[PDB]
């Protein structure tokens, strides 16, 4: 098979860098592992997930970490912060509260399908903020081939293309919105330990400021059983998550309040009867869950080796050289066409620790260099096979690959300077 | 609701124990929990799992711990190896492998029915040693309620029921051969610290022992793409797990060497191509892995909190009043009935903690108290609602409920007998 053999020819890259780096053994350790993983994430020759457990039996055997040691990477607590955006999706959804959202606020437009059309665009994005991204293109779908009903010229593609490619980007911008949304959001807070209210005033904006901008290039080319409850038991969650710092200070100072609050909603939605646990067990994406733990495996695998301050050294040189706004700029340039070819999460699982403990070893806040690769990596915007969002609006049968390769080609530029621009207003 | 409300009623209980009980406030917390505890997992008014999420909350709350301390018991080295058997199991039913391992032995009998049901059992519980119990029951069924189909005269029910209650006993069995199978196995394992080699040289002899002492009472009354690779990976693995005491002294001491041998599995399984990662997601019951850690976090809790230590002394009069015997036997018999009012798996994360821990109170090994009790949890024979295996082949709407109310009461006694035996036998 095609895949079978990029683990072959990875593991020979791996005895290769081993055997012959000409560097102290543990960089070499490091670096060989790097390039061992980055090849298994990128290509996914194995499920990014099974490259995932891949990370910690490597650093076991070899030294780097004992057994138990590095199995714990799995139980951070933004693991469970994104289980609980699981168990909270999963509740509105065997609610059907996603549909009622959708009704009531397709049902406000009379009756124009010219105006409708835009109004499936914010509501794919608000949607993918607690929900997800494959999920919420999956469920638009279906959305989306009902509207297109009372005028189906196939030869008018110019009013027709433009609302499947819409919300194929609206659940990938609307993913940048929350920590709960994108697995890349998570991977970021769990690498420089930030709170939901502190990703919050970073993506946000970003999704209210790429939303409009993303549509403008396109264009110019009933209440049952606690629905209230899941709502009340939803905005109080929601609630406590953005008041989560004063709250929290106002209390006795615990340590992971956002995890905390996640873990109560699970609670409160079970207690609340709500739903069902075997919902919740369906719901998570537990494979992604377990990527996150590998991430740090790995992330701690090139500090205890010295790979971080390894590379740091070597571009120590460049990076000087550079300003930080051409090094910001390279980086989300670099990105925001890495995310073309493969994974969102498989790229910021790859990126963040790499960036962030070299950014570590320079005695810079890893959060400017984190917090943006994680929202560039969900900038997938040409081809398919970026993000299933393109596939599964692809998978229409009509959007051509030209098409899009230039329409995402035009989209992947504009998001690089309004990131770019971003990132430099969050300095100072 | 019931179950809305037995929270409420335990809720009181909480509260009352609290306030009302006359001892150093850290006894009363940890009094005041497990007692709440308790409740919810025998009664299980809010899912197993969901009571397990409820652990932690309340101790970072009421700061026993901190969030991250609690979280990370949801990463012990069991976990991770129950989780091996997992894609263990999934890999060989998606393949297959389990269908051909009973035509091939079933097939061996001519189509004598005398020794068709005798292969029915031994196929049952040695495919429970490795999958599960509720899906080795339900992949069962069928195949006896198919060789039951000769012989159809549901009048004739002592040569129907036989089969049913008799493979839903076999299932049942065959889970105390390994340490992967049962939950019960793996929290006992966790607690006081047991190799997979150490739970075989315990339950497997058990298993040899009770499968036929079962059936006695019971009585008196093509190979494809890979399927030999599925084969060769799982016996390449039990193989390692049986040898695993040797292989990791003579490799440098590695810390939970059966958890990596689990993971590598999970590698080999996904190198191979054999399972898909779906798969993996489908088969593994994440609510019990979630479980896990709460039943380590419990016993965490006794002995931060003292509870440990304050039920030896508390127990000191009675315990020195009773001897060993009585103590096994005691115990014993609690829960072999204990477990036919509620689920297996959960009894055992409420005993196990707190006797192995009060057995350490006591300075005792806990490991005889804790196999112990591992190994009586998995004895549910009465009537159904105890063990799923046991309401599938009482589904069958034939098998009566005072037939098996009765059959279970005379099994459950032979287990006692057989256990406590053991139990003073492995000793010295
Ligand atoms: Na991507
Ligand atoms: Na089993
Ligand atoms: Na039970």
């Not at 901008?213 to 939803?234: E, P």
Request: hydrophobic share 60%.
């Amino acid at each position: 098979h095609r895949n079978s053999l990029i683990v072959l020819a990875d593991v020979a890259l791996f005895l290769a860098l081993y055997h012959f780096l000409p560097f102290e053994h543990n960089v070499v350790l490091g670096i060989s592992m790097l390039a061992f993983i980055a090849v298994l994430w990128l290509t996914e020759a194995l499920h990014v997930t099974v490259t995932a457990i891949l990370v910690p039996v490597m650093a076991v055997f070899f030294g780097i970490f004992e057994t138990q040691a590095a199995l714990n990477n799995f139980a951070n607590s933004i693991i469970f912060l994104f289980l609980g955006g699981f168990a909270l999706a999963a509740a509105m959804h065997h609610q059907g509260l996603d549909k009622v959202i959708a009704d009531k606020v397709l049902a406000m437009a009379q009756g124009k399908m010219s105006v409708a059309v835009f109004m499936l665009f914010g509501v794919t994005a608000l949607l993918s903020m607690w929900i997800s991204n494959t999920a919420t293109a999956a469920m638009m779908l279906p959305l989306v081939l009902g509207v297109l009903s009372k005028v189906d010229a196939d030869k008018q593609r110019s009013t027709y293309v433009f609302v499947l490619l819409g919300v194929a980007y609206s659940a990938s911008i609307g993913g940048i919105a929350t920590l709960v949304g994108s697995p890349p959001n998570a991977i970021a807070a769990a690498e420089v330990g930030l709170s939901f209210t502190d990703w919050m005033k970073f993506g946000l904006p970003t999704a209210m400021m790429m939303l409009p901008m993303a549509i403008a290039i396109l264009y110019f080319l009933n209440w049952d059983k606690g629905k209230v409850v899941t709502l009340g038991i939803f905005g109080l969650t929601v609630f406590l998550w953005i008041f989560s710092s004063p709250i929290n200070a106002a209390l006795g100072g615990f340590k992971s309040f956002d995890t905390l609050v996640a873990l109560g909603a699970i609670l409160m939605l079970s207690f609340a009867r709500v739903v069902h646990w075997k919902e919740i067990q369906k719901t998570a994406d537990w494979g992604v869950l377990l990527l996150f733990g590998g991430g740090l495996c790995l992330s701690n695998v090139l500090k205890q080796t010295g790979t971080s301050v390894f590379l740091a050294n070597a571009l120590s040189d460049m990076v000087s050289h550079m300003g930080i706004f051409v090094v910001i700029l390279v980086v989300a340039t670099f990105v925001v066409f890495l995310t073309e070819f493969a994974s969102n999460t498989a790229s910021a699982a790859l990126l963040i620790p790499v960036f962030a403990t070299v950014a570590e070893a320079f005695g810079m806040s890893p959060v400017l260099l984190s917090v943006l690769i994680a929202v560039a990596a969900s900038c997938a915007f040409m081809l398919p096979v970026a993000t299933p969002p393109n596939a599964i609006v692809f998978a229409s049968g009509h959007i051509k690959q030209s098409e899009m390769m230039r329409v995402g080609l035009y989209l992947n530029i504009a998001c690089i300077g309004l990131l770019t621009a971003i990132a430099m207003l969050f300095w100072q």
